[PDB]
Design a protein around this ligand. Structure first.
Ligand SMILES: COc1cccc(-c2cc(Nc3cc(O)cc(O)c3C(=O)N3Cc4ccccc4C3)n(C)n2)c1
Ligand SMILES: [Cl-]
Length: 209
């Protein structure tokens, strides 16, 4: 069995209980994006053609107040279906074990990505996440995540093409729409992501009124 319903319920409950500073979700997403960007930058050293699917390496944040969503897209190396399968099965089970053993030992759990389950820190602010990903060696896939969900990985033949990389669309919880506001987003990136050595872009939209 996969146990994704059980694992996502547990992590949703544990993460929201013990991390009262919800804004670190954006630190974990940018840090995962940065890691994936390092991977394609390195692969392109020996094979320049790896960048033919997308020449620019960046992270872009796209709020949408009408949809209630925050989207973080990068042009990193992306994930094959094998990669996403490995994350949903092997990594989720093992990292959950390490995460809550560190919880239970009173260890310092502030850097949650350390345990490989940094993805689920999205649950601090989001009630569901849609993962789109494209790796040079596979097709574009989409997978939906929610606390208790058992959605299947599906070939994305309807969404916009990524070229290469990963796009995380977070459906923001009702009482937390503050994380869709420009000034709040910019504050959070400045505070938690000074170390990042790729461009971080934010899409702002003119208001009417
Ligand atoms: C552990 O349970 C789960 C359950 C479901 C998904 C994941 C999961 C999915 C990723 N992946 C990415 C997340 C992002 O927010 C942004 C990204 O760009 C990626 C990505 O595509 N990466 C490829 C790659 C290659 C080398 C090193 C790092 C990375 C990250 N993570 C880091 N966790 C984990
Ligand atoms: Cl908007």
């Amino acid at each position: 069995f996969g146990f994704q319903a059980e694992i996502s319920q547990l992590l949703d409950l544990i993460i929201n209980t013990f991390y009262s500073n919800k804004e670190i979700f954006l630190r974990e997403l940018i840090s995962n994006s940065s890691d994936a960007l390092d991977k394609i930058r390195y692969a392109a050293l020996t094979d320049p053609s790896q960048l033919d699917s997308e020449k620019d390496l960046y992270i872009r944040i796209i709020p949408n107040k009408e949809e209630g969503t925050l989207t973080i897209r990068d042009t990193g190396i992306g994930m094959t279906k094998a990669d996403l399968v490995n994350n949903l099965g092997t990594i989720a089970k093992s990292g959950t074990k390490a995460f809550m053993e560190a919880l239970s030992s009173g260890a310092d759990i502030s850097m949650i990505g350390q345990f490989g389950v940094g993805f689920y820190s999205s649950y601090l602010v989001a009630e569901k996440v849609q993962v789109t990903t494209k790796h040079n060696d596979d097709e574009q896939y989409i997978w939906e995540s929610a606390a208790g969900g058992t959605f299947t990985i599906t070939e994305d033949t309807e969404g916009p093409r990524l070229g290469r990389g990963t796009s995380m669309k977070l459906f923001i919880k009702e009482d937390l729409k503050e994380y869709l506001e420009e000034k709040r987003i910019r504050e959070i990136v400045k505070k938690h992501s000074e170390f990042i050595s790729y461009p971080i872009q934010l899409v702002v939209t003119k208001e009417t009124e």
